[PDB]
Write a protein that binds this ligand. Sequence first.
Ligand SMILES: Nc1ncnc2c1ncn2[C@@H]1O[C@H](COP(=O)(O)OP(=O)(O)OC[C@H]2O[C@H](O)[C@H](O)[C@@H]2O)[C@@H](O)[C@H]1O
Ligand SMILES: Nc1ncnc2c1ncn2[C@@H]1O[C@H](COP(=O)(O)OP(=O)(O)OC[C@H]2O[C@H](O)[C@H](O)[C@@H]2O)[C@@H](O)[C@H]1O
Ligand SMILES: CC(C)n1c(/C=C/[C@@H](O)C[C@@H](O)CC(=O)O)c(-c2ccc(F)cc2)c2ccccc21
Ligand SMILES: [Zn+2]
Ligand SMILES: [Zn+2]
Lengths: 282, 277
Amino acid sequence: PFTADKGKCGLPEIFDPPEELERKVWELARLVWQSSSVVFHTGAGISTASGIPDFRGPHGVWTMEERGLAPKFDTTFESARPTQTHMALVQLERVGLLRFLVSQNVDGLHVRSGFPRDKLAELHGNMFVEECAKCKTQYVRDTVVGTMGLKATGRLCTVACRGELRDTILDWEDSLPDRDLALADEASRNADLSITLGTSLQIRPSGNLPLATKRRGGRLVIVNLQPTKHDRHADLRIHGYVDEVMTRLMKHLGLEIPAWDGPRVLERALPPLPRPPTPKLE
Amino acid sequence: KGKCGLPEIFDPPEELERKVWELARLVWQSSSVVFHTGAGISTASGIPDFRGPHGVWTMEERGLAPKFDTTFESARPTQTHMALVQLERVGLLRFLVSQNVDGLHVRSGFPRDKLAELHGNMFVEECAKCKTQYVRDTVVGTMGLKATGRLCTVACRGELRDTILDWEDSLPDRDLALADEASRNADLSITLGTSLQIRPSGNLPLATKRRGGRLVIVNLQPTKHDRHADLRIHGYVDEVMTRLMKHLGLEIPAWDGPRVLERALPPLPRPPTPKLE
Ligand SMILES: Nc1ncnc2c1ncn2[C@@H]1O[C@H](COP(=O)(O)OP(=O)(O)OC[C@H]2O[C@H](O)[C@H](O)[C@@H]2O)[C@@H](O)[C@H]1O
Ligand SMILES: Nc1ncnc2c1ncn2[C@@H]1O[C@H](COP(=O)(O)OP(=O)(O)OC[C@H]2O[C@H](O)[C@H](O)[C@@H]2O)[C@@H](O)[C@H]1O
Ligand SMILES: CC(C)n1c(/C=C/[C@@H](O)C[C@@H](O)CC(=O)O)c(-c2ccc(F)cc2)c2ccccc21
Ligand SMILES: [Zn+2]
Ligand SMILES: [Zn+2]
């Protein structure tokens, strides 16, 4: 809690220079095309471009705490817009180039971006979601659930039940949800490409799931401004703003990054849309 | 560098809700609305401000660095940026004055002939001879009005220089005159994300007061002229502008990607006006 191991905070940022950045995002493009089963793992770095501070970056929550300073929010959780990266992941899932998405974020922007819930594992919970203690029915609300650490919110289940509604925000002691951790674990083992965006991969086991892609010869790409726990296991490390890496990647894939309709909830992935034909790689 | 790192104020929801309704009334009641924007309308796209808690000057005074969560090239316009584009298209915004050099107003497709970029635009270089501007797709690599290395290509070969003013540099006369003219003639100035400490860029909203115009200030910190405002709103500008638009019955439009529009298009249809009192 107070004393919890918050891991390495405030490490130096690394910027790949343009030419080397340009060539790494082509290598990423080549890996996406070549792969049958692409899982994305996201952390707090995909939401900074929308005004929400990270945990272990230069100006992150834990970093500034060690220095006796406050993290700063440039928006509310309710007024946060999904980033170019968020929407990019929405399109990649609609054209069938993303099998599964595993996010350690509680900021709720994945769900709000319209990404389908049955293809998302929210390992650390969601600030807009409360859950019936009795029947496990989840409610995706339009404002943040007012509590953290899996406590009574004040509201009751309304299914065909009256059970106690509770927040989904894990405390330090709280084990991951079983459904999300099994679906994230299964997707990770079976993938032949895991890509990590904006996570420093220091948390167990959320950070270890990308290593499961390595077993049976799968490839691993790490996109991050700072060093990550598992940098040495990566076949490709890109050091750049994820928005810049994801817009350049989409351009290579010949994909437009769609308009954000405003807050929308999609329970179940739709049928896959048409996608460009694949380049000849050799 | 003026007063930096002042405490933030948050209006409570009920009060915030009420003030943005009072904003909505003033927009509807007003013949000629000008908006004045500063660094605060780009924070939510990952570009730090100057005198906010984590801003350039603040962090300098405390021997710390300002943090960028994007490049200038990869920055997307905020919900506020795109709201100003729609307000202009439906004829409820006469003019827009910005102290921002971040280039996002132009890239949002807001029309140049209705914008004054008082402190310059990092994506614009200007011919020293014929004053032809070039809006490029990557930041012009200099600041302080220096030669960039590139030449005029008009029907000229003159020296292209950046448009970023240094401290000593006088504002561009065209942009300052148009900004000043629009400010005097407006019956509503709204300021969004500016602390209004810079001369004269910060004083232009006060010219709206002369001949009984109204002034709204939307800002998280105190501003120089809080005392002259008929309405002060302490909230995230994005929240204020999305709630405001919702009252106006206006969608906030999709961003096509970087686009340059020289001249304002014909005004589009807008919802009918409420009966006010
Ligand atoms: N715009 C950007 N582009 C690319 N990388 C970025 C950007 N902004 C930040 N980063 C990088 O993004 C990385 C973010 O890493 P961390 O801050 O540790 O977040 P987590 O999601 O891994 O934290 C996991 C859990 O830990 C907590 O306890 C909670 O329970 C969280 O769920 C940094 O290395 C940045 O350099
Ligand atoms: N999301 C937000 N919502 C509302 N207000 C905000 C937000 N983020 C920041 N603010 C406020 O936004 C304000 C930003 O104040 P300053 O940083 O002085 O920006 P300027 O444009 O007025 O500076 C003018 C010139 O001065 C420089 O030298 C350069 O020349 C500039 O061009 C703060 O008061 C924040 O509380
Ligand atoms: C002013 C504007 C173009 N301008 C500068 C630029 C600021 C600095 O290069 C000059 C300043 O430090 C010294 C002086 O006062 O003359 C920065 C900026 C600040 C810190 C940073 F790490 C990178 C860029 C900046 C950021 C957002 C908007 C406008 C900005
Ligand atoms: Zn129930
Ligand atoms: Zn010329």
